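Escalation from tier 1.

The customer reports that the assembly of two entities below gives different structure tokens on two consecutive runs. Tier 1 could not reproduce it. I'm attaching the input and our single run for tier 2 to review.
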Amino acid sequence: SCEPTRGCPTEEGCGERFRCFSGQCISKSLVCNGDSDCDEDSADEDRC
Amino acid sequence: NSAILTIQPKQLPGGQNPVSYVYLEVVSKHFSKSKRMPITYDNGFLFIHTDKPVYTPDQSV
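Tier 1 run:
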């Protein structure tokens, strides 16, 4: 154990781009494209 | 929390053309981001009061 002067880095999402469940970012033109553009979790294919 | 900050008006590199964009940055222990925030030289207000809304010739405004 050790008390750090170092921060844990935050982690950051996608803004104008769509975001999958993992946190990877993908173009909005690939939401409901019907391929699985999100590599594993295909949130781009949810409830279209 | 809040800072109060400004573009210091004299400190812009300026000259014949305006700086139209600036960065706003945070450096916490845990995160940094910039972001290209706009700036405007439209600061505060000017309101103009004329001793009348109308004049004739041979008057002074």
